[PDB]
Design a binder for this molecule. Sequence first.
Ligand SMILES: CCCCCCCCCCCCCCCCCC(=O)OC[C@H](COP(=O)(O)OCCN)OC(=O)CCCCCCCCCCCCCCCCC
Ligand SMILES: CCCCCCCCCCCCCCCCCC(=O)OC[C@H](COP(=O)(O)OCCN)OC(=O)CCCCCCCCCCCCCCCCC
Ligand code: SF4
Lengths: 158, 166, 101, 298, 100
Amino acid sequence: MEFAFYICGLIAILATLRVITHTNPVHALLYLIISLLAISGVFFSLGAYFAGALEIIVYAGAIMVLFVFVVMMLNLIEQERQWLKPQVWIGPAILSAIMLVVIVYAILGVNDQGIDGTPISAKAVGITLFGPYVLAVELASMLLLAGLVVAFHVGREE
Amino acid sequence: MDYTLGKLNDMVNWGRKNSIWPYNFGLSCCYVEMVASPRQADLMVVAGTCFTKMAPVIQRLYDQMLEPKWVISMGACANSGGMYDIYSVVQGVDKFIPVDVYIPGCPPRPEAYMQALMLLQESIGKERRPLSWVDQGVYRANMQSERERKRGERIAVTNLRTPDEI
Amino acid sequence: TSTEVIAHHWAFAIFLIVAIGLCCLMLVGGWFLGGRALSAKFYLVAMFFVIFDVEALYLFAWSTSIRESGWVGFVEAAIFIFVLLAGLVYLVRIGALDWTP
Amino acid sequence: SPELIEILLTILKAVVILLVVVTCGAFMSFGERGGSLQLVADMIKMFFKEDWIPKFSDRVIFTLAPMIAFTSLLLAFAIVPVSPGWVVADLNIGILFFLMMAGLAVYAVLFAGWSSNNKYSLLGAMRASAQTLSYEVFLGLSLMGVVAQAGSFNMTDIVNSQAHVWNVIPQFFGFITFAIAGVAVCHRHPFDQPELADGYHIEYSGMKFGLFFVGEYIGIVTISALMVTLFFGGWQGPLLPPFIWFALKTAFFMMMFILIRASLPRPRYDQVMSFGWKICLPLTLINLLVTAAVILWQ
Amino acid sequence: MIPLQHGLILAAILFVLGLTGLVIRRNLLFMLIGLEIMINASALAFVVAGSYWGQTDGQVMYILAISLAAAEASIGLALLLQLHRRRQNLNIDSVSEMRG
Ligand SMILES: CCCCCCCCCCCCCCCCCC(=O)OC[C@H](COP(=O)(O)OCCN)OC(=O)CCCCCCCCCCCCCCCCC
Ligand SMILES: CCCCCCCCCCCCCCCCCC(=O)OC[C@H](COP(=O)(O)OCCN)OC(=O)CCCCCCCCCCCCCCCCC
Ligand code: SF4
């Protein structure tokens, strides 16, 4: 379980690094799908089986399909490759590195008994979701309705 | 026999002859008698009169076809121009594309097309082609002609039925 | 960790790698051997698929624990599905799910 | 050691199942078309044909699309139990894994249409992708009826829950919706070609085209087997061995897919989307609600 | 057997990668892509935290996070389509006239 976790984490990091630097949008979305598949593998390593199934079904299988659809209908800044020359990403890269080093300083120093990896099934997640999480479920349906209304209002052609 | 410019070679020849995906290009009144993209097709069946206006269409659709490519000409029009030795008709589809099997007739029967399919499978199975492109020369067999092979049984015919019957 | 579960893990891994290797070898043998010689309705449909897929995930989570949730959970899913059907009805009547006007 | 020969026997069972599924998909390409070697003939014809990637195209996406169209449903087969002691992966998620593979399957159509440097093929791919999303949106709930009755995502547990009454009778609406969704997600008749829009299989030739065809028929094998497992008791039978019963039911559904292709006509594109969403999604939500009320009452 | 610290660090790495991809790109599409990366990293961190304690709450927060991600991706791609259909240009620095 540690083996799959570490290879999938490394694949996700590498794929994200190719995502944020690539020039072709379809290639970047393909690397993003690869990173999502790796993150699902990480979820399956931890025992969150429902989370991994949802990472493939919902994130890679719906959201990235929407991004892919938008890129295809765009038929697509690319030529100069601004983000490749160091005079553009000199600042943001070290800024993100400083933020990352402060965050991982906070990570190092906490109680860590390790993750057992015992599978938390989707049935227990359903009992929790439809037990002590009634208002999260109803208002999450409410939120998705809001997003649907907004995206139809903005994205229709006329 | 003569060739004009090994077990698995027999295997690919057998597979190519035993699964042919045709692209019937019906120009004219041969098309009704004989009744897939050219990128997915390997046999071009040219049936009909080869007009001067539609000759670039035939040439383009032959060029879009992928190797290996075989051509079967149906009828006198596709063979030689037929009865239309006229200003607007190309005298035979072999003026601009190579033809593997010719069929006479105007129109030929569908069973004549099936017999030409047998001839094409025989010519495919009796040929040697470059297996992998990593000699890149196509070797086509100089087959014995059908009229000399069937000469004895044709000449041996003596009596036929009178034309006063149906 | 029983012997059966690690046997099934090995079988699943072998199934994965044999399927992927068979497809890749199939395409490799295809390439190596031979002789060389839009309207906004698409975005709306994909978007509706995404939203209703997330609602479907909530229904997935409910469905596997019906006997452990009782009638209260049925009521919870009842308002959930009622809001889902109200949104679907809204999309149908406003012409959002109408490919031909 | 018994453990090593046990894991090797399980691996051999998985490989045997995989080879049988691949050969069944190819053999039913022939069956949809005595001539047992005809399949081998087209197989080596496409094998030895030269391959043509378009010059101004994208090579990686073009090569990647048939791999998705093959491996998605080929991997989705792995949850199906054939007989007692003959499963590949007895997953806790099961039908969730089938939903994962069915979700990943749309990228084959999208990738083929974009990589084929052709506006007509691209438009056809977007049309087919919109269609398969419109039916994937209720595929999962059409299976949630059976999941709700069984109370688990496992497949062996579903088959054991079918030990007295097959789920074709109580989940007949789930039966119907999963049948339509399985046919539509496989892009076959009457959902075969929705296409200024041409096919997205143009510019594909040779072994890639063979990958697309064999992937479609492998998906047919997987959909029919999961159909049998979910709605027709799986391997349960009174007299014949469970392997035999599973085989006859799977063949029964596979020739009924062939018969539906040979008989039913093609509805229109907007008609297909309107039917899919407007009928099958509220019908499936109502089916799951009524199913929950019935099981909670009992 | 897996440390919580390593999963949290992996989520932080993906979060800061999404943030710098959000900053450095003039195209709005890559900005939306970086936003998706950041929210997926946050959801991953919640899954790691929930799986460490043996609780269902991490996957529940993951479900809420991906619901948010789906809705935001929908809205952002609608706005990107509007920008492309009204300006024929996805340069985000051209959308800058309000200032002062
Ligand atoms: C080989 C070197 C690298 C080569 C290049 C990369 C190839 C892909 C590598 C990542 C995927 C495979 C990782 C290795 C998995 C091998 C099996 C394994 O380790 O299983 C352990 C565990 C079994 O489950 P459990 O019951 O918890 O057992 C623990 C102890 N009994 O398993 C689990 O708990 C979960 C198992 C993993 C989750 C399922 C598979 C996820 C696949 C993600 C693919 C991501 C995209 C890859 C793209 C490649 C190209 C860039
Ligand atoms: C083009 C290539 C793209 C990448 C392809 C994949 C790359 C990696 C290939 C090698 C994988 C080796 C096998 C990995 C381990 C398999 C077993 C496993 O995951 O076991 C862990 C878990 C067990 O759980 P369970 O048995 O239910 O419960 C008892 C717990 N002991 O079971 C689970 O968690 C099961 C759920 C996870 C199963 C994942 C299977 C692969 C999914 C990715 C398919 C990608 C398809 C191609 C790309 C699509 C388009 C982008
Ligand atoms: S050969 Fe005769 S039948 Fe055929 S196209 Fe010419 S005129 Fe018509």
